[PDB]
Design a protein around this ligand. Structure first.
Ligand SMILES: [Zn+2]
Ligand SMILES: [Zn+2]
Lengths: 119, 170, 161, 49, 116, 50, 121
């Protein structure tokens, strides 16, 4: 009892993707790479983790996360299975793309009104 | 639990633990190493002789001495290891297959310190910098947990679990 | 009148006590002999201890500090005015020599600690409709969950289904 | 149909009481009950309510 | 007060303290190098048993832009005087016993934090 | 022997906001089996049965 | 189960409870700071307690007031115990019970730097 489980009707498992397009897209932006960076510049910044690999450092999470969300919404460079997590308390953006990340679809609500209109 | 990507070798585990109890002496349990090794010796083995560099990789801000008082004990514990060769010898002496000579032990230590531990960050010829930064991040997280500034990570939280469907199983 | 002493340590302690008693000039306003009071205090301390060991020196130092404490000159004024006899001052403890505000704060802290040390009483609906068979009294408290009966005075524990 | 009114009134009263307890705890008025910490006594009061 | 680590000048290593027996002063020597420097803090170690840490020093201004954090209008800011503001508990382990909130202004270029 | 814990970061479920110690946000089921149950309290009731 | 009159009143039972409860310095101490004060009369810190009482280092172990009153202790017995437990090797200069801060001063008289750390721990 409790060990055996069953998925939910809407539950879906990520099949898996590749991190290369994401790495290239984050590299084009103003993202200093982890290999050449002043250690003193890590405090006032946010550490980006992709598939558990600490790479690059950014100085504007509030915009980077919005760009990532819009890009994923448009389904062009990042597949819908990828997930970007935003950690507010500690500045860390941990992105994952390996398989096995159980997920489900949810509607989007911009301010107080859904996008699933009559159209 | 590090694992590069469906690689031939199995996933490797890195336990960077800390003694309870001087007190507060951080250790590590590297793969294929039966005994424990302090983190400072590992950092010096990766190619960091200077102490300031090691602390910068571990601790990001120096204006909080309250965090510095926690690392001073373990830092001073390993004060007889400065050069890289002695650190490599010390790490290899604890290997499962201790080389009968010194050169074999150095080679074995370098191999375990470049292929076994943290294979996901990189297993190429020159990736010691990223490994050192990742290790420093692990130590930073451990210290934050010890101070209580960040709650521990729940074991049953599925956010830290992955499902293996028919694909990976086959 | 305190008997004179030829011991150097005792004389030094008496001089220190007199000097401390002179802090604030309360002796002039009260017209009390500071030297006589210091000699009496030293004599009481010597009688209580009966040796010029570290305990006697510690007691003398504590008395000097308490008498010279500028945060509670009322104690010094009372001592110089006869309110606290020299025997009592020598035999008094640190808690007794504290100022009125300090004493009130200590009492409040002690009361709070005593109250916090207690344990919360078991809750329940107290009523006199159930007669306890272990004491014959009617006071008791019940709890519905089967209704458990808890005696108030006798403490008879039972349940009704 | 009247018992429903009584039950709803009681539930609303309990909700108001627990909200008041939370407000007091937030503004630092609920003193710690003897033998327990602040969180413990807060939880005990909520459970009793 | 506290004490911070001061690295060497040449070898850049931990400087251990040393009580100069000759001049009767406080020095910081290097285990490897022979560097010396006259001290100024006159302190070596301090322990905080109560661990009286100011939670405000840990809170950051970025917490304001959190979509899963409550907001209130009854606790306006002080500097800018904006109305909207967030509030939350210490959110830190080892909480002794207190749910005292930590209000943070919800507006750009302010990042003010206070407590009531 | 306690109320519903905070499985997520300082909240029971994603619906409720952080630091919500209210009754309905920690397991208090306000409805009854005759009048149906809210999904959140339904899940908490399932936890108790488990 | 209390036997004496303490069974009735809680005032005379709190002391019994305190004496049956294990109390150590950690429960009563609030801050502990070591200083390499060369001359005892120099007193790098502002405290007018050493000149009245009279090694180039000392421990300033300031105690808490609320806990000390809760357990109802006095600095006299604390100093006596701390001096007898470690032999006639140190010299604890306690403070009067009138000042606001409950400071202390532990000094050693007769590798030496870590000795104070070890002993305080
Ligand atoms: Zn040096
Ligand atoms: Zn503001």
């Amino acid at each position: 009892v409790g060990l055996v489980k069953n998925l939910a009707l809407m539950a879906y498992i990520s099949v898996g993707s590749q991190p290369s397009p994401i790495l290239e897209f984050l590299e084009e932006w103003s993202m200093e790479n982890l290999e050449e960076i002043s250690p003193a510049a890590i405090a006032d910044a946010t550490k980006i983790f992709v598939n558990g690999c600490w790479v690059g450092i950014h100085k504007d999470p509030e915009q980077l996360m919005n760009t990532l969300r819009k890009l994923r919404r448009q389904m062009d460079i990042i597949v819908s299975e990828v997930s970007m997590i935003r950690d507010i308390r500690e500045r860390e953006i941990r992105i994952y793309t390996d398989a096995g990340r159980i997920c489900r679809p949810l509607l989007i609500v911009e301010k107080q009104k859904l996008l699933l209109k009559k159209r | 639990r590090s694992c590069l990507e469906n690689s031939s070798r199995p996933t490797s585990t890195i336990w960077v633990s800390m003694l309870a109890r001087i007190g507060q002496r951080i250790v590590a349990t590297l793969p294929y190493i039966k005994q424990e090794v302090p983190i400072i010796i590992v950092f010096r083995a990766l190619g960091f002789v200077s102490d300031r560099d090691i602390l910068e990789h571990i601790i990001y801000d120096f204006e909080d001495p309250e965090m510095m008082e926690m690392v001073k004990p373990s830092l001073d514990e390993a004060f007889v290891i400065q050069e890289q060769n002695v650190a490599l010898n010390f790490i290899g002496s604890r290997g499962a297959k201790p080389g009968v000579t010194k050169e074999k032990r150095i080679k074995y230590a370098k191999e375990v310190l470049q292929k076994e531990m943290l294979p996901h960050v990189g297993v190429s010829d020159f990736c010691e910098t990223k490994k050192a930064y990742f290790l420093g991040y692990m130590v930073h997280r451990l210290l934050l947990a010890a101070l209580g500034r960040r709650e521990l990570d729940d074991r049953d939280h599925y956010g830290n679990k992955r499902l293996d469907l028919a694909g990976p199983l086959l | 009148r305190a008997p004179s002493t030829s011991d150097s340590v005792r004389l030094k302690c008496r001089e220190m006590l007199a000097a401390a008693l002179r802090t604030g000039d309360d002796y002039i306003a009260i017209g009390a002999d500071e030297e006589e009071l210091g000699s009496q205090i030293e004599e009481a301390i010597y009688q209580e201890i009966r040796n010029t060991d570290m305990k006697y020196k510690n007691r003398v130092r504590s008395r000097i500090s308490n008498l010279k404490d500028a945060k509670n000159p009322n104690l010094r004024k009372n001592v110089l005015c006869g309110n606290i006899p020299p025997d009592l001052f020598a035999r008094m403890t640190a808690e007794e020599m504290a100022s009125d505000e300090l004493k009130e704060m200590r009492k409040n802290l002690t009361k709070e600690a005593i109250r916090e040390h207690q344990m919360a009483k078991t809750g329940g609906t107290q009523t006199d409709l159930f007669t306890c068979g272990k004491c014959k009294k009617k006071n008791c408290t019940y709890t519905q969950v089967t209704t458990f009966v808890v005696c108030n005075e006798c403490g008879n524990r039972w349940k009704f289904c | 149909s009247k018992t429903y009114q009584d039950i709803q009134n009681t539930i609303k009263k309990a909700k108001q009481d627990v909200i008041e307890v939370i407000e007091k705890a937030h503004n630092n008025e609920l003193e710690p009950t003897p033998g327990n910490t602040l969180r413990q006594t807060f939880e005990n009061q909520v459970n009793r309510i | 007060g506290f004490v911070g680590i001061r690295f060497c000048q040449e070898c850049n290593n931990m400087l251990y303290p040393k009580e100069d027996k000759e001049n009767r002063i406080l020095l910081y020597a290097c285990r490897n190098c022979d560097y010396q420097q006259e001290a100024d803090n006159s302190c070596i170690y301090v322990n905080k048993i109560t661990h009286e840490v100011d939670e405000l020093t840990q809170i950051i201004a970025d917490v304001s832009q959190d979509p899963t954090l409550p907001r209130t209008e009854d606790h306006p800011c002080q500097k800018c005087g904006h109305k909207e503001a967030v509030f939350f508990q210490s959110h830190s382990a080892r909480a002794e016993d207190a749910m005292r909130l930590y209000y943070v202004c919800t507006a750009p270029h302010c990042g003010h934090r206070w407590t009531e | 022997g306690k109320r519903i814990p905070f499985g997520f970061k300082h909240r029971t479920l994603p619906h409720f906001i952080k630091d919500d110690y209210g009754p309905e946000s920690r397991g208090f089921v306000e409805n009854s089996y005759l009048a149906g149950l809210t999904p959140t309290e339904f899940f908490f009731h399932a936890m108790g049965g488990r | 189960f209390l036997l004496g009159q303490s069974a009735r009143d809680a005032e005379r039972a709190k002391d019994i409870l305190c004496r049956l409860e294990h109390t150590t310095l950690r429960k009563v101490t609030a801050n502990t700071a070591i200083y390499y004060d060369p001359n005892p009369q120099s007193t790098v810190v502002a405290e007018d307690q050493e000149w009245v009482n009279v090694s180039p280092w000392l421990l300033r172990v300031e105690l808490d007031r609320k806990h000390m009153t809760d357990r109802k202790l006095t600095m006299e017995q604390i100093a006596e115990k701390i001096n007898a437990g470690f032999g006639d090797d140190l010299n604890c200069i306690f403070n009067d019970d009138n000042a606001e801060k409950l400071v202390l001063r532990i000094r050693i008289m007769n590798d030496d730097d870590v000795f104070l750390r070890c002993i305080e721990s």
